[PDB]
Amino acid sequence: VSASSRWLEGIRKWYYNAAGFNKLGLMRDDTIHENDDVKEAIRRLPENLYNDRVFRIKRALDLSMRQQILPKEQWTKYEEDKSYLEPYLKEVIRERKEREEWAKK
């Protein structure tokens, strides 16, 4: 345990609760701005994760339409929010940078 790490964890938890996307039941990776890299990364997802993402986004958009939020027991927990779009986006960025490095020569 580190005191600086403790402060970072506390600040990150506070900021997660303040951002408010969890109130609509979304995860962090749902809210990423979609560009070419992210589009390819989403295109590489398996079936079940893609369908879950689609349903979560659809429910969030309906809640936004009606100006409501979920009950507090259905909000996404900060600790259980594990990123599902990390490795795909990481690999896509890695390939793109390899292409750029080849293009430099």
Partner: protein, 52 residues
């Protein structure tokens, strides 16, 4: 930000393309002097001088 354009190929391309951009700059400079009748430059041209 734009570090991807730092390499041997991009400086070979710039070295190949600086004469053309130089000539299009001469085209624009002469075109501006001609279109505006800039006496400051045209007084120095030999035969043109007689117009004024």
């Amino acid at each position: 930000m734009l570090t991807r354009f730092l390499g041997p190929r991009y400086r070979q391309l710039a070295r190949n393309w600086v004469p053309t951009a130089s000539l299009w700059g001469a085209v624009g400079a002469v075109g501006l002097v001609w279109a505006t009748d800039w006496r400051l430059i045209l007084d120095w041209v030999p035969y043109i001088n007689g117009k004024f």
